[PDB]
Amino acid sequence: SLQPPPQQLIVQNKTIDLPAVYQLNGGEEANPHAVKVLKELLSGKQSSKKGMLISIGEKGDKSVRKYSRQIPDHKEGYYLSVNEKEIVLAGNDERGTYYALQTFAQLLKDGKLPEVEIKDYPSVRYRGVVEGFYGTPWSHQARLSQLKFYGKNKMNTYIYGPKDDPYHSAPNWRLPYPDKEAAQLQELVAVANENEVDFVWAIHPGQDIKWNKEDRDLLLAKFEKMYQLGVRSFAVFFDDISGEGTNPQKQAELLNYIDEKFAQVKPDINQLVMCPTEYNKSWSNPNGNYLTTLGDKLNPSIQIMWTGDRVISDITRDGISWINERIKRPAYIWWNFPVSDYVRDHLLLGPVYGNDTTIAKEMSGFVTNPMEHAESSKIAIYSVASYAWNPAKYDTWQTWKDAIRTILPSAAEELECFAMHNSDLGPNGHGYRREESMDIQPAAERFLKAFKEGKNYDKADFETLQYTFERMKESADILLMNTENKPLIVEITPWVHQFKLTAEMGEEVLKMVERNESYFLRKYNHVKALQQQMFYIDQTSNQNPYQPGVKTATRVIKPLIDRTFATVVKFFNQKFNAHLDATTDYMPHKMLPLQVKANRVLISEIELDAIYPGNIQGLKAPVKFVFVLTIEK
Amino acid sequence: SLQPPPQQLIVQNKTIDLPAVYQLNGGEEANPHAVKVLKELLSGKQSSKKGMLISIGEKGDKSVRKYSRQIPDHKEGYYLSVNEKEIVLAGNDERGTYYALQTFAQLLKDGKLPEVEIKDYPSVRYRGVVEGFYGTPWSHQARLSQLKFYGKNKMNTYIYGPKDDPYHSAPNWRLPYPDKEAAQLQELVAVANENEVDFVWAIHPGQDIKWNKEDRDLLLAKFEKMYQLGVRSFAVFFDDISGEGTNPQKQAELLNYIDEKFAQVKPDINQLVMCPTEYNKSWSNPNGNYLTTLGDKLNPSIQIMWTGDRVISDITRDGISWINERIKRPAYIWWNFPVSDYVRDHLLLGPVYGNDTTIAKEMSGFVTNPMEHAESSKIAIYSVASYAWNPAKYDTWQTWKDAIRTILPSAAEELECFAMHNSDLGPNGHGYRREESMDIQPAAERFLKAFKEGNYDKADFETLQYTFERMKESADILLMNTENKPLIVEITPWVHQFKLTAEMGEEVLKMVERNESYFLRKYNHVKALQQQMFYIDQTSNQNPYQPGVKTATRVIKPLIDRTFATVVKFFNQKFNAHLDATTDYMPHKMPLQVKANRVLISPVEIELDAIYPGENIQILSAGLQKAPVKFVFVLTIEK
Ligand SMILES: CC(=O)N[C@H]1CN2CC[C@H](O)[C@@H]2[C@@H](O)[C@@H]1O
Ligand SMILES: CC(=O)N[C@H]1CN2CC[C@H](O)[C@@H]2[C@@H](O)[C@@H]1O
Ligand SMILES: [Ca+2]
Ligand SMILES: [Ca+2]
């Protein structure tokens, strides 16, 4: 198994022992990063001037002369060969040699190798991640982890642009990083270079940029300082701003100036990229001159970024054609998934899917905007790496599974379970949704429909729902305690607690469906308690100003549990002339459901659970009795 | 249902409405505290020269003098009568009137009273609580709540004596409380008074006391400061100290000096109590003269405390006679339960039992030394209140249940479930144990021995399953209970751990029940639950003596752990596998134990789970001076 999958692969039935004794050829001449990976793998093995031949080099090296016709004629291409006789690792270029080895490392299992021959190369030129979300920027240790991950997955591009980094956006875009941050970024560049990733430093000046000499030189002066820190690629982002910085001509002029006086003037600059203000079709004015002014005026080597037909979308053939025709070059894709900065109570841990797999030629680049949860975001990132490199062979589900087994081999099945029920976004103003819990959706829907209606439900559907809740709890508790990937566990823990709760609630509700009056009342009271605990988690974990709290299994599982609860409570009330409360979300205040957001109490007379100092949509007057009410808390 | 149960109760089969209109007689002259209760109960109702008569007062008061023949001739005794024509509430004295109303309040239900006649009084003169434990003394708000609870259950004695209050013990017993604390104590005393509790301020000066005039004077000066704060009863404790302070002759002289120059000089001093240095028979040096010296020299009015035949023990007739003959007066019992300050990883939430119910005449007082967990301690305190008032009718189990229902009416069943399996102490240096989980014990032992010997009863399996499910319901209901927040805050750590124990139980039973991969899923889940329990045990309740959180330790945990190991042995034999059968999660390798920052072999090589700055090793010792160690009987690291 290989990720990304090679363009061409021919395998035998045969396997070969990794050489105890071996002759290395091309060591001094090949990309040193690739030699480092190779030497890592042959540690504990003996080098010699006569032994199994291992040949490593770039096309043009003496070491790989015999194979020059075998090496694909593509940037980052390579040829790889394992047979009884020798091993070959030959890139079209230095990066190609590195990538050959990243594939070699995946072939190698328990000191054994398959007999194989591979011709490989990326279908999309630029592939990777833009850290370009709103919210807490990735930690330095997290960024270090990402860059190594990108290397292993042949992603060649990391665009640094955390919207909340004050040295990236307004107004301190004009200011050089302080010493500590500068040395961190310096180390990120070195580590990026070691793993063959272009560290692209972006800047986001358009909210308060003046179109005068002063700001122009401050911007170039900032680029110069970034250049002194080792940065060799650059971007200027004009997304999510208003005012004069939206001017397409000025933007074009500025990028051209950067290109002509900086990028075309330094010895060794690589990418120069901009993000447009009109960055998706729905935000683009068909009758305005923005995108055509940009396509016409931007120098042809400058990349232009695009998110698709909509603020969040998957890339279609009609979609990419539409933008390419306007900007006069293939779009450099900014894919807004799994970024969750607008649904911050959800984790998006589902598969990567929905992007046309036949349009490689039509895009210059493909980058994923991820979640503020760095490790969690690796599921999608690994998948994107696989998609951008070989889109024709992109396998949605198998790649998702491969990602998860890579990220957490010690508890892959458990993480699969968690992830599969943590993938939709819930309703949102962008209308973008993912499937979730699709395996159990038919059983759920049949179970529920029977019930409400008053027809008998299938025992098998009941057991499946039961099996699921059981598995959720084993998964939650094993993940909670996993020490192979702590940063991942730390990131997910609040959702994991909530996920266990949801499952326990489900179990108890299934018990309510199943024997006498008092058993039912024990179960019902247990459910109420479990709802309260969920509320507690939702009110104290992940309390950010936009979408605070912790939602999980929201698409299929929680609504099923909730609706089943209302239904059996209703029937118990008809049967025993009772008035048990059928409400499914715990709510300590009383009133058409109320919600509690941070220190606000809102209606989707109100009586709070206590006296608090009171505004209403100004009040510190004590208040217990009273569409949002804010209190002190 | 009345707690404490009255000495005499005659109930009719009639019920009376608490009158709309009532004319009150004796309210300007009766104990004001009692009046207050009584009018709080009559809010809603109207007063006037007409309607049903209610008579309140002490014997001798115009209001209730005609009932003298009904009023028991006992300190704190009372007579209460309810019938169609009138209500009588009549104390032998002011405290009796108060107590009469505490009984009245329990009779009153849904605005209705039964026709009854009660004649009541306590069988033991002093009854209450000594706050006398090691650890975090009770908070101020907790102490307020306690005094109100004593009022309600007829405990007349609160002895303040937290071992860790530096103004109570050494070094600063010589020093007056700072302003903040003094104001709080003064509040406490006021509240004590309003609830007919005697606030007894104790002092524990023995560890560093000099037998000269300067310390004698400072001790009296301190008592004088407490008197200015409103304290009217006092104690001197000479427990758990060494050196010159243990001299029985000098102790008696000092107590006699306090009596003669202070207690007999102030107008209104009530109790004067000492706790001895030999405070139990086992600790009492046979043929030594310590207790006889006290009994002979201490002024006859001074009380002497005693914790029974052993440091922790239940009081018996043989036992109380052996103390009384020596101290030449009836011992004042300091009962060491539910105090847990020497098993701080356990909560002791079981019934109060073991004390002879026939020996009321042989004791001057009976006080419980509780847990540092104030609200939790109310189960036992409520029960001791019931025992000390009416021993002859003391009912262990029904009183336990009654306490729980008074403490947490909204989730009494769930609290009982929690308490039932949180009552033993575990092995300890004092050898004192309590029963726990006795209901499921039979099914447990049968289940186990069918395995060890070589089938099991489908019914026992189900009993166990039922139990784990109840434990889970109760844990989750208790966590979210908002009727008694402070109680919940105290027990939460044990509640989490009790839930984990129950979950582990379900998963082990599923292991007892189908195919290879299902077994392994259950086994992996169990391993994770063991780790979670370790985590709670390493992060909650971290004190220096017995850190952690142990729960359901007598029957349930051992059952689960043995059932795990046994079926893992069977799986290993069956599938020729090598699953680890150990039941307590341990991150470090070689039975290892982790206490705070220590790693010790339960009395060749230890591999820690990481490199830590090592500090030292006791086996013989060495400073390690922060040297890094992963690889190496106790090791101390920087954790
Ligand atoms: C071009 C672009 O998508 N810009 C911002 C806005 N999008 C829309 C969806 C996210 O909020 C994402 C956010 O992370 C990005 O910084
Ligand atoms: C009289 C007495 O029991 N004194 C101390 C010693 N006992 C023995 C058992 C308790 O630790 C208890 C402790 O709380 C007391 O302060
Ligand atoms: Ca070369
Ligand atoms: Ca009077």
Q: For B481-522, give the DSSP string.
A: --SSHHHHHHHHHHHHHHHHHHHHHHHHHHHH---HHHHHHH
Q: Are residues B78 and B58 in the same domain?
A: yes
Which residues lie below 8 Å from residue A312, measured CB to CB, with a gap of 6+? A336, A337, A339, A430, A432
Say which amino acid occupies A477: D
Q: A368 — phi, psi (to 5°)? A: -95, 125
Which residues lie below 8 Å from residue A425, measured CB to CB, with a gap of 6+? A340, A343, A346, A348, A432, A433, A434
Which residue has the least CA distance to atom 6 on ligand 2?
B240
CA dist B57 and B515 (Å) reads 76
Query: How far is B93 from chain A, CA to nearest CA, in Å?
Result: 41
Residue A468: CB atoms within 10 Å:
23
Which of B12, B222, B264 shows the shortest CA–CA distance to B113? B12
CA dist B186 and B191 (Å) reads 9
CA dist B353 and B337 (Å) reads 10
Which residues lie below 8 Å from residue A571, measured CB to CB, with a gap of 6+? none
Which of B422, B405, B433 shows the shortest CA–CA distance to B494? B422
Rounded to the nearest angstrom, the distance between the alpha carbon of A294 and the centre of ligand 1 is: 20
Cα three-residue angle A476-A482-A484, rounded to 5 degrees: 145
CA dist B316 and B309 (Å) reads 8
How many residues are present in chain B?
Answer: 639
Q: Are residues A403 and A413 in the same domain?
A: no
Q: Tally helices (H) and strands (E) across chain B.
A: 16, 21
Which residues lie below 8 Å from residue A516, measured CB to CB, with a gap of 6+? none
Cα three-residue angle A377-A383-A387, rounded to 5 degrees: 140
Burial label, B451 (beta-carbon count in 10 A; 0-12, 13-18, 19+): middle
A240 is catalytic: yes
H-type alpha helices, B279-343: 290-297, 317-327
Which of A222, A199, A169 shows the shortest CA–CA distance to A273? A199
CA distances from A416 to A370, A403, A407, A410, B82 (A): 19, 10, 11, 12, 70
Please give the residue of chain A at the shortest CA–CA distance from B528: A478
CA dist B554 and B423 (Å) reads 9
Q: Are A305 and A273 in contact (CB under 8 A)?
A: yes
Among residues A240, A296, A356, A585, which one is catalytic?
A: A240
B77: β partners? none
CA dist B73 and A131 (Å) reads 86
CA dist A74 and A58 (Å) reads 12
B241, B275, B306, B339: which to mutate for ligand 2, most atoms within 8 A of CB? B339
Q: Are residues A387 and A442 in the same domain?
A: no
Burial label, A610 (beta-carbon count in 10 A; 0-12, 13-18, 19+): exposed
Residue B332: CB atoms within 10 Å:
27
Rounded to the nearest angstrom, the distance between the alpha carbon of B309 and the centre of ligand 2 is: 14
Domain finish residue from B121, B142, B157: B121
Q: Which domain holds residue A168?
A: 122-407
- DSSP E strands: which ranges in B216-285? 233-237, 272-275
- Dihedral over alpha carbons A354, A359, A365, A370 (to 10 degrees): 0
Q: Are A331 and A304 in contact (CB under 8 A)?
A: yes
Q: Are residues A138 and A86 in the same domain?
A: no
Domain total of chain A: 3
CA dist A167 and A285 (Å) reads 31
Using H for helix, E for strand and C for coil, what is the string for A546-577?
CCCCCCCCCCCHHHHHHHHHHHHHHHHHHHCC
* Chain B contact present for A530, CB below 8 A: yes
- Residue linked to tokens 């020299």: B297
Which residues lie below 8 Å from residue A291, measured CB to CB, with a gap of 6+? A248, A276, A278, A284, A323, A326, A327
Q: Are A168 and A177 in contact (CB under 8 A)?
A: no
Question: Which CATH number does the domain housing residue B161 bear?
Answer: 3.20.20.80
CA dist B194 and B192 (Å) reads 6
Which residue has the least CA distance to atom 14 on ligand 1?
A133
Q: Are residues B80 and B131 in the same domain?
A: no
* Chain A contact present for B477, CB below 8 A: yes
Which of B338, B332, B336, B334 shows the shortest CA–CA distance to B351? B338
Q: Are residues A321 and A425 in the same domain?
A: no
Q: Are residues B49 and B30 in the same domain?
A: yes
Which of A606, A569, A562 shows the shortest CA–CA distance to A586? A562
Q: Are residues A456 and A434 in the same domain?
A: yes
Domain finish residue from A386, A407, A428: A407
Which of A353, A436, A343 shows the shortest CA–CA distance to A399? A353
Question: Which CATH number does the domain housing residue A109 bear?
Answer: 3.30.379.10
Q: Which of helix, strand or coil describes residue A214?
A: helix
CA distances from B148 to A350, A439, B197 (A): 57, 58, 9
CA B558 to chain centre: 26
- Residue linked to tokens 């302070």: B245
How many residues are present in chain A?
Answer: 633
Which residues lie below 8 Å from residue B409, measured CB to CB, with a gap of 6+? B483
Q: Are residues A129 and A262 in the same domain?
A: yes
Long-range contacts (CB closer than 8 Å, 24 or more residues apart) made by B227-232:
B227/B266, B229/B177, B229/B182, B229/B185, B229/B186, B229/B189, B230/B186, B230/B189, B230/B190, B230/B193, B230/B199, B231/B185, B231/B189, B231/B199, B231/B200, B231/B201, B232/B198, B232/B199, B232/B268, B232/B269, B232/B270
Which residue has the least CA distance to atom 1 on ligand 1?
A239
CA dist A115 and A113 (Å) reads 7
Q: Are residues A397 and A268 in the same domain?
A: yes
CA dist A307 and A319 (Å) reads 10
CA distances from B606 to A349, B91, B590, B593, B639 (A): 40, 71, 5, 12, 17
H-type alpha helices, A195-345: 213-228, 248-258, 290-297, 317-327
Token pair recorded at residue A618: 């100004």
Token pair recorded at residue B102: 């505490």
Say if residue B176 is preceded by a cis peptide, omega within 30 of 0. Answer: no
- Residue linked to tokens 């002509």: A260
* Chain A contact present for B479, CB below 8 A: yes
Q: Provide the edge-to-edge strand list for the sheet that holds A600-603.
A: A594-597, A600-603, A628-630
- The per-residue b/e assignment along B173-190, b for 16 or more CB within 10 angstroms, e otherwise, is bbebbeeeebebbbebbe
Which of B538, B319, B546, B541 shows the shortest CA–CA distance to B429? B546
CA dist A347 and A371 (Å) reads 8
CA dist A457 and A447 (Å) reads 6
Q: B126 — phi, psi (to 5°)? A: -115, 130
The secondary structure of residue B541, as a DSSP letter, is S
Q: Are B391 and B124 in contact (CB under 8 A)?
A: yes
Give just the sign of the alpha carbon dihedral A290, A291, A296, A302. Answer: positive
Q: Are residues A419 and A389 in the same domain?
A: no
Q: Which of helix, strand or coil describes residue A127?
A: strand
Q: Which of helix, strand or coil describes residue B610?
A: strand
Rounded to the nearest angstrom, the distance between the alpha carbon of A389 and the centre of ligand 3 is: 23
* Rounded-to-5 percentages of helix, strand, coil across chain B: 40, 20, 40
Which residues lie below 8 Å from residue A262, measured CB to CB, with a gap of 6+? A220, A223, A224, A234, A269
CA distances from B522 to A477, B464, B568 (A): 12, 17, 11
Token pair recorded at residue B180: 């903040």
Q: Are residues A266 and A399 in the same domain?
A: yes
CA dist A550 and A498 (Å) reads 7
Which of A375, A419, A410, A489 shows the shortest CA–CA distance to A146? A375
CA dist A321 and A301 (Å) reads 19
Question: Which CATH number does the domain housing residue B578 bear?
Answer: 1.20.58.460
Using H for helix, E for strand and C for coil, what is the string for B81-110?
EECCCEEEEEECCHHHHHHHHHHHHHHCEC
CA dist B389 and B125 (Å) reads 8
CA distances from B536 to B371, B417, B555 (A): 21, 21, 20
Cβ of B338 closer than 6 Å to ligand 2, yes or no, is no
Cβ–Cβ below 8 Å for A529 and B480: yes
CA dist B339 and B370 (Å) reads 4
Q: Which of helix, strand or coil describes residue B573?
A: helix
